[PDB]
Ligand binder design. Structure first.
Ligand SMILES: *[C@@H]1O[C@H](CO)[C@@H](O[C@@H]2O[C@H](CO)[C@@H](O[C@@H]3O[C@H](CO[C@H]4O[C@H](CO)[C@@H](O)[C@H](O)[C@@H]4O)[C@@H](O)[C@H](O)[C@@H]3O)[C@H](O)[C@H]2NC(C)=O)[C@H](O)[C@H]1NC(C)=O
Ligand SMILES: *[C@@H]1O[C@H](CO)[C@@H](O[C@@H]2O[C@H](CO)[C@@H](O[C@@H]3O[C@H](CO)[C@@H](O)[C@H](O)[C@@H]3O)[C@H](O)[C@H]2NC(C)=O)[C@H](O)[C@H]1NC(C)=O
Ligand SMILES: Cc1cc(=O)oc2c(CN[C@@H](CC(C)C)C(=O)O)c(O)ccc12
Length: 654
């Protein structure tokens, strides 16, 4: 096919070895800041000692800064707490003598050039959490279940409430937290009170009662609330930060049951609801843009209750695309993909040249299935979960199998450049994989029981590969590290030599491999979501199309750190398919027409009794959240009031 020439020399001077000498136990790695190059490596020993290393070169060289922490012992439970973005804030938690009045931290605002020791008034139960708004604002939970806040980068701490189960930063330095009264968080479960502070503890407002748990995603604030004189509970939603609430359109659940936010974005959430009775699976619902009304997206979605693992995956390299696992009747697992944000799920098309396996009832006809958290947890030979990056358009890389179900065999690696519509076997056998330069470079390391001296790369998005021996002394591979955001040319291969064992890291700079900077000609026009190009609506997803400029497979050049994914939207005519049925409406049959329910049952009937004025009254149709369509069809009909229809059956008092 095609390759890069004289590459060996180009990677020769760019391969940078660093040996880590003393290392043991927990090894944490933290990137600090974007486009800084700062990496922290924290190690701990036990009968012990903590070693701390720093690199400004993206891992090409480190320097032992343990002398900055006074060679004291860092507790790994709390790891390295890194400030948001380029703040440079770094906080480590030291272990203190048993009798100490309070804990102790080592903090740096300088990207760990200098640290300062600070004795705390308390003992941290949790890692310290930075306010996303202001990186000098931190909150922590004490072992006494106190809520402590620092206005200056952990220098001074104030205890704002004395009983707290859970606490979170919202937007604008807001703090949400749950509290208890009588006794342990555990005991008062369901009886918890939900509070909010917007002043950092000057004043509070209790925005919920009978609270079980809460959580944030997108614009939504979710709270689980227990039913009066009952063992069950249900979701309530707030977009006003607790000021007003509304009951969700979801079913209630018992105590063995749970809710989970699978994904949330400014438009909506995917809510997973556990099935009653230890199924190991649930149903996924997608919400409307209020987070109030829930369409039912997927049945028998696999989510384990203990050590809860779900293969649910945002495919971040193309808009609207998500993959996940479902549990079949034959008790086997199948991967499904949605291109529309959960309006439709379907099996993943299999590679043209792939062959079906034993799991498949027909040798000619089967599909592609993806290994993800679940496979991993069951200890199938799976080095990495699925990878995609938003700056690498359409690209998805995953271990998988081709057949009627996820198979237990040793998986090859598969790739897609179109966002999951079509696939190809990228490499045979399990590999660790990473994306550099927004897809300009793909890198892979073989997964082996025995040591490896070799790395593999592709500049054509996985179509052909080349091989580079980065060391004479082969190592046992322990991981890849590369700058978050997939924009660098720099990749770190982590491992240890055969023993007297020690860790080493070989960091490779591809700057010479692609010497040429990409230019306008190197990009070609690509419509995302194309199915039938003769169709006027081809590629409309959620009301609109996007056309991209993508880097040619053939063209090899660096995209650049400043690279901008450029795309243009086309606004499609609204059709009924752009709407979801509103409360008390459903799509019977083939027709996409939303029609009125004859009567509301189950949680529909629950809501209908217990809902509120806005949602109970309806147009029968709402725009799918995030759906940008213009013109064409707007359903025309008058808002009705459904409260009468539910209460219609009940005898009412005077
Ligand atoms: C599945 O993965 C997709 C790819 O990552 C997700 O798409 C991304 O969604 C996020 C959030 O909706 C978008 O984030 C951007 O954030 C910046 C930050 O600016 C500020 O925005 C508001 C202020 O108005 C506030 O939240 C903060 O102050 C932020 O600092 C915005 O300026 C952007 O306009 C945009 O909102 C990404 O743009 C988007 N990526 C792509 C490639 O479209 C998708 O949401 C995921 N699905 C789910 C359900 O989570
Ligand atoms: C691969 O790793 C190397 C480090 O080994 C990274 O080197 C860094 O390169 C950037 C730009 O190429 C340098 O940035 C600087 O930016 C400021 C802002 O204008 C200005 O002083 C200069 O224009 C300068 O270029 C940075 O100093 C440099 N750092 C080191 C230690 O060499 C390189 O960025 C990595 N490659 C990629 C693609 O990320
Ligand atoms: C795996 C798992 C098991 C479980 O029992 O509960 C989970 C929950 C709890 N969800 C809360 C609702 C609230 C947080 C919005 C609730 O169920 O009341 C998760 O959020 C995520 C994962 C689990």
């Amino acid at each position: 096919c095609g390759r890069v020439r004289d590459f060996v020399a180009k990677l020769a001077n760019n391969t940078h070895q660093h040996v880590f000498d003393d290392l043991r136990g927990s090894v944490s790695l933290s990137w600090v800041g974007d486009s800084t190059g700062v990496i922290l490596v924290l190690t701990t020993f036990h009968v012990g000692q903590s070693k701390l290393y720093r690199s400004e070169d993206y891992g090409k060289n480190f320097k032992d800064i343990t002398d900055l922490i006074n060679n004291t012992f860092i507790r790994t439970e709390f790891g390295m707490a890194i400030g948001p973005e380029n703040s440079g804030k770094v906080v480590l938690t030291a272990e203190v003598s048993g009798g100490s009045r309070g804990g102790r931290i080592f903090r740096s605002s300088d990207f760990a050039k200098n640290f300062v020791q600070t004795d705390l008034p308390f003992h941290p139960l949790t890692q310290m959490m930075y306010s996303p708004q202001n990186s000098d604002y931190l909150l922590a939970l004490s072992t006494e279940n106190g809520l402590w806040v620092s206005k200056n980068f952990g220098g001074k701490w104030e205890e704002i409430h004395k009983a707290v189960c859970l606490a979170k930063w919202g937007s604008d330095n807001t703090i949400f937290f749950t509290t208890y009264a009588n006794g342990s968080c555990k005991a008062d479960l369901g009886a918890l009170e939900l509070w909010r502070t917007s002043d950092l503890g000057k004043s509070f407002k209790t925005i919920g009662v009978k609270i079980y748990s809460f959580g944030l995603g997108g614009r939504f604030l979710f709270a689980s609330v227990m039913a009066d004189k009952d063992t069950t509970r249900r979701i309530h939603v707030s977009t006003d930060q607790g000021d007003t609430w509304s009951m969700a359109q979801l079913p209630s659940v018992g105590q063995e049951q749970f809710y989970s936010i699978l994904a949330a974005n400014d438009d909506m959430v995917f809510m997973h609801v556990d099935e009653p009775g230890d199924t190991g699976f649930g149903t996924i619902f997608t919400s409307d843009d209020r987070g109030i009304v829930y369409s039912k997206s997927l049945d028998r979605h696999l989510y384990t209750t203990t050590g809860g693992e779900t293969d649910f995956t945002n495919v971040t390299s193309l808009r609207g695309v998500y993959i996940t696992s479902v549990l079949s009747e034959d008790n086997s697992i199948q991967t499904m993909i949605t291109f529309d944000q959960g309006g439709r799920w379907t099996h993943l098309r299999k590679p043209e040249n792939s062959e079906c396996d034993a799991t498949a009832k027909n040798k000619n006809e089967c599909s592609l299935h993806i290994h993800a958290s679940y496979s991993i947890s069951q200890k199938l030979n799976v080095p990495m979960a699925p990878l995609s990056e938003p700056n690498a358009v359409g690209i998805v890389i995953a271990h998988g199998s081709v057949g009627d179900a996820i198979s237990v065999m040793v998986p090859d690696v598969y790739i897609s450049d179109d966002g999951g519509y079509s696939w190809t076997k990228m490499l045979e056998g399990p590999h660790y994989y990473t994306i550099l330069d927004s897809g300009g470079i793909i890198v892979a390391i073989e997964h082996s029981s025995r040591p490896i001296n070799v790395i593999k790369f592709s500049t054509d998005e996985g179509q052909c590969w080349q091989t580079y021996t980065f060391t004479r002394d082969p190592i046992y591979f322990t991981g890849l590290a590369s700058e978050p955001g997939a924009r660098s040319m720099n990749i770190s291969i982590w491992g240890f030599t055969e023993s007297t064992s020690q860790w080493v890291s070989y960091t490779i700079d591809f700057k010479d491999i692609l010497e040429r900077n990409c230019e306008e000609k190197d990009y070609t026009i690509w419509l995302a979501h194309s199915t039938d190009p003769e169709d006027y609506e081809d590629g409309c997803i959620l009301g609109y199309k996007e056309q991209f400029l993508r880097l040619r497979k053939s063209s090899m050049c660096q995209n650049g750190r400043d690279y901008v994914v450029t795309k243009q939207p086309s606004i499609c005519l609204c059709s009924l398919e752009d709407f979801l049925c509103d409360f008390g409406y459903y799509r019977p049959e083939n027709d996409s027409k939303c029609v009125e329910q004859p009567e509301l049952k189950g949680h529909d009937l629950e809501f209908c009794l217990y809902g509120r004025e806005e949602h109970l009254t309806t147009n029968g149709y709402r725009k799918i959240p995030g759906d940008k369509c213009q013109g064409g069809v707007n359903p025309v009909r008058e808002v009705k009031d459904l409260k009468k229809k539910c209460t219609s059956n009940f005898l009412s008092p005077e």
